[PDB]
Amino acid sequence: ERKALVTGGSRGIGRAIAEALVARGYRVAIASRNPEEAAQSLGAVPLPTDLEKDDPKGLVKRALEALGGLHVLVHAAAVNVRKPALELSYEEWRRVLYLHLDVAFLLAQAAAPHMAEAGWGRVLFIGSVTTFTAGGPVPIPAYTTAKTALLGLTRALAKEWARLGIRVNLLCPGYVETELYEPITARIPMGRWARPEEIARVAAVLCGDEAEYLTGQAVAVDGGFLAY
Amino acid sequence: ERKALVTGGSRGIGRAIAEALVARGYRVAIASRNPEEAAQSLGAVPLPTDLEKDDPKGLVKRALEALGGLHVLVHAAAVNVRKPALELSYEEWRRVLYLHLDVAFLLAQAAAPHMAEAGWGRVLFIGSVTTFTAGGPVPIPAYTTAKTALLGLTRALAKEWARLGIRVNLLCPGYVETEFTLPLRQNPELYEPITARIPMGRWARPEEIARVAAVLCGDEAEYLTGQAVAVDGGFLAY
Amino acid sequence: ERKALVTGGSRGIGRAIAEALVARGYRVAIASRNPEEAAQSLGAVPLPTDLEKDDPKGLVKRALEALGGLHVLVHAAAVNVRKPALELSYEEWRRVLYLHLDVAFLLAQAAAPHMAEAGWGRVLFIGSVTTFTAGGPVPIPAYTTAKTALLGLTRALAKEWARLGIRVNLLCPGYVETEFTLPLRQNPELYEPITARIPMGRWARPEEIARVAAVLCGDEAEYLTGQAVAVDGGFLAY
Amino acid sequence: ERKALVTGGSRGIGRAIAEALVARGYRVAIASRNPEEAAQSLGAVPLPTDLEKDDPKGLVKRALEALGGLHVLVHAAAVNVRKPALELSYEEWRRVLYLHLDVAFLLAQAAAPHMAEAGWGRVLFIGSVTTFTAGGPVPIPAYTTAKTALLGLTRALAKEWARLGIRVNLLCPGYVETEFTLPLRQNPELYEPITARIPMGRWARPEEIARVAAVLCGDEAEYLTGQAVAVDGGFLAY
Numbered sequence: 001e002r003k004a005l006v007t008g009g010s011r012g013i014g015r016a017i018a019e020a021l022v023a024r025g026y027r028v029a030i031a032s033r034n035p036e037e038a039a040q041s042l043g044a045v046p047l048p049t050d051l052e053k054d055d056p057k058g059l060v061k062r063a064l065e066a067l068g069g070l071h072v073l074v075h076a077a078a079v080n081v082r083k084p085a086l087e088l089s090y091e092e093w094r095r096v097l098y099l100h101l102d103v104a105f106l107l108a109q110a111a112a113p114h115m116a117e118a119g120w121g122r123v124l125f126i127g128s129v130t131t132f133t134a135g136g137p138v139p140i141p142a143y144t145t146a147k148t149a150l151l152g153l154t155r156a157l158a159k160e161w162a163r164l165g166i167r168v169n170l171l172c173p174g175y176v177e178t179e180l181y182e183p184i185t186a187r188i189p190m191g192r193w194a195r196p197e198e199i200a201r202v203a204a205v206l207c208g209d210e211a212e213y214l215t216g217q218a219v220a221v222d223g224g225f226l227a228y
Numbered sequence: 229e230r231k232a233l234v235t236g237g238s239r240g241i242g243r244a245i246a247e248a249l250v251a252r253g254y255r256v257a258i259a260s261r262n263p264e265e266a267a268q269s270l271g272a273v274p275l276p277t278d279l280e281k282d283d284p285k286g287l288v289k290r291a292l293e294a295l296g297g298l299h300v301l302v303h304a305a306a307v308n309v310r311k312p313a314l315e316l317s318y319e320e321w322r323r324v325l326y327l328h329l330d331v332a333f334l335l336a337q338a339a340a341p342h343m344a345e346a347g348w349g350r351v352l353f354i355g356s357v358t359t360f361t362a363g364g365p366v367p368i369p370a371y372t373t374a375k376t377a378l379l380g381l382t383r384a385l386a387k388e389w390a391r392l393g394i395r396v397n398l399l400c401p402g403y404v405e406t407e408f409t410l411p412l413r414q415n416p417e418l419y420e421p422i423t424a425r426i427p428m429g430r431w432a433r434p435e436e437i438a439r440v441a442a443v444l445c446g447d448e449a450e451y452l453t454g455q456a457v458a459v460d461g462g463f464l465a466y
Numbered sequence: 467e468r469k470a471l472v473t474g475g476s477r478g479i480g481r482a483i484a485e486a487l488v489a490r491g492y493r494v495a496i497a498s499r500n501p502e503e504a505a506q507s508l509g510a511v512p513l514p515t516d517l518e519k520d521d522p523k524g525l526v527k528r529a530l531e532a533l534g535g536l537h538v539l540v541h542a543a544a545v546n547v548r549k550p551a552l553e554l555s556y557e558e559w560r561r562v563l564y565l566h567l568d569v570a571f572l573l574a575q576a577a578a579p580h581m582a583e584a585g586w587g588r589v590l591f592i593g594s595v596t597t598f599t600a601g602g603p604v605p606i607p608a609y610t611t612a613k614t615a616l617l618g619l620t621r622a623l624a625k626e627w628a629r630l631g632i633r634v635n636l637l638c639p640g641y642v643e644t645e646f647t648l649p650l651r652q653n654p655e656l657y658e659p660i661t662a663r664i665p666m667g668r669w670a671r672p673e674e675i676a677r678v679a680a681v682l683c684g685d686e687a688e689y690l691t692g693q694a695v696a697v698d699g700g701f702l703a704y
Numbered sequence: 705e706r707k708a709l710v711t712g713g714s715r716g717i718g719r720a721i722a723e724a725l726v727a728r729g730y731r732v733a734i735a736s737r738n739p740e741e742a743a744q745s746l747g748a749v750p751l752p753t754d755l756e757k758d759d760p761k762g763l764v765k766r767a768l769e770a771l772g773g774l775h776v777l778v779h780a781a782a783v784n785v786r787k788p789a790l791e792l793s794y795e796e797w798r799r800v801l802y803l804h805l806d807v808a809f810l811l812a813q814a815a816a817p818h819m820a821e822a823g824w825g826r827v828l829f830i831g832s833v834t835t836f837t838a839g840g841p842v843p844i845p846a847y848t849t850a851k852t853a854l855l856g857l858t859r860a861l862a863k864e865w866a867r868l869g870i871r872v873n874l875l876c877p878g879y880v881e882t883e884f885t886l887p888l889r890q891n892p893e894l895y896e897p898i899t900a901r902i903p904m905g906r907w908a909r910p911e912e913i914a915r916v917a918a919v920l921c922g923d924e925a926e927y928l929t930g931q932a933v934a935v936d937g938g939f940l941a942y
Binding site: 084085086088090093094097101102105106108109112113130131133134135139140141144145146147148149151152153155156157158159160216 | 550551552554556559560563567568571572574575578579596597599600601605606607610611612613614615617618619621622623624625626692
């Protein structure tokens, strides 16, 4: 009976989250460019889409109609341009910010009215260790900025929609399997990278009744990396 | 099968957490001054103790023997002295810091070896909105200090025990409806300004907080450690 | 001897910062739509510009030519669309995000090479208490997002340019008495709940914020980079 | 004119801060076990004391008498027991927490009335990168807890004393070359992993940290209170 839309749900963390939601009895729709196999394997509705191109509210409408309602939104679509600030063009910077941040805003804005109508909703943005740091040995200023920006959007939307029955949170995965590895892994207390399913367990919690009084927060699932 | 000890488990947030763990199928022991009756309604093992005076590792030893093992530790004992710093005595300062912080360290230190031999453990300290703020219209410097100190201890123990299979986190409840917070809730001069900052527009029921505590005490937290998780209806984000 | 460019330098915080830098002996250029009056009062070079519509790197080029170099960049330009997310248009969202965040990136990107050439540089972005909260009673989702995003950019650029002799930080002012915040002060429903949370019991002068900005634009910041420094009269700590 | 008391002022960061305050024209008193030589070199009043055992308030009383007043308090005393939680005794835990935290509370509590009297005051506690992390490869659970606890105390006291004209902040230095940190620098498995995370590629000099401490003990911090200011070469931002 709860209806969920997961962007970037055919691979990595997005797929793991979609699977976790199906396991909870949710009716799920997976949006990505080629969601056929993922939708078939997980038992979800496929919604082929190119979010760097297609109108976000158009996708929400498609999900609403395919699922017969909409209660949960998970934005896990990804893209990145790994270049330092001095080499990055305005176009590349905007490409990253658009998909991670602007699309997050537009998708949530479009989905909110439907969650409000149901009097229950869950919005889960996907953060990163770069929501709190600069990525360490990797040059990713645009990504870092976008993932940190999501924390602000998370607080802002959580404040605004709390009375509507909607909870808005930011799941920040640590280093997950989807001269750099060694130093990073040494900063992970658990001593290993995460399995997508391990991240998805928490995503599911933030998508369910467990988060009834939990909103406007970032939850880091990083094997102890940030605490190190 | 998993064995848990919850201090301050006879009422308030502690009881709600104990109740939530029992519902998850855990064998729970609750500690407080007089847990007999509470324990029986909850279906938990009572461990009478005054944590402001009794040796913490003595409690862990009793829990280990009563439960046949120990996998989860939740330190939810509550106490406070609502007085400004210039009025607070060092004895009062120490009373608050001892129960909330020193005892957290002692209990965790004593419980860790048992979790390590089981190869799986969960330590859940209880924070507060004062882990990130100073309590607003309420004068609680000692409490604020202790609850903020717990974030440091959380990170420290999480780092040290990660390889042992132990996860250590800090659950930070917002404003909850309990006898403990009644002096706050009943007084408009305090309740109104505080509640105006809670996006959800209401205080929480202990059970709503316990839902998240249960998660941090289970397999859902397999890769989650050294973190504070705030369940406050949007208060901090406001 | 140090050359500085301050956007939004003819009014409020920007003007106060420009005055503080001139007081430190820096050669300052201020950019705004009508900087003439302020430039001649402060003893700075006027750079008439519409930061929302003129190419950012072009402004940096003009500043470089007018000052004969560039060591300091302060992006204090301000703009806002105080509407809730459900009422906000994408164009409005973009107006706020562009000026506060995109322009911050573009200006810093254009200025960095000149600072690196000198082997010494200071980039100061301007944050807000909304870099850490959602603005409270004020409906400002776009502004909050942009000001929080700046902390990420601050960390990223600080890391990338640290060895070039450039320091990048985010000065986060609390509630300051300026024309930009006039709407907040004129509505009791915003002013009262906000001010009740400021321990110092008053809004802060632009000059009081500039005292700290000057520090972050000087040798005092030699080992300070990638950080947010909040000057809010105790608001966030409350 | 301004009268300041600096604990741990004969070495490392404490000494650098004392020197910076003297340079600002402050009348300084420095407290440590053997402050005679440092006091003479710096031009400050020596106040021999063992803060790990002597009554903190007696120290403030002595400072008041020696300086003819008291406007500034900097608690830079340092001690540590670098052992993991499972190897640390409660006595060692208490030793670290007492000196770093309890004494901070006692010293501030005793000094505040005198600052309020003057209508102007500055309390500067000393943090660490462990106020935000667990110390990485270094086993310091007690120190981490204490330095994080100070952030809570900083917020609490700042809120309570704001209207008295007192500002309370936490200066969090990164990795500084002092004999206190010598053991970190002497072992590659601590120094290398740590230094690799400092964007500036070097440890700080005590004086570089003192530059910021001076700012937090002056008029520049008029509207800055209840905050932590990290001076770490970009470490936390990495």
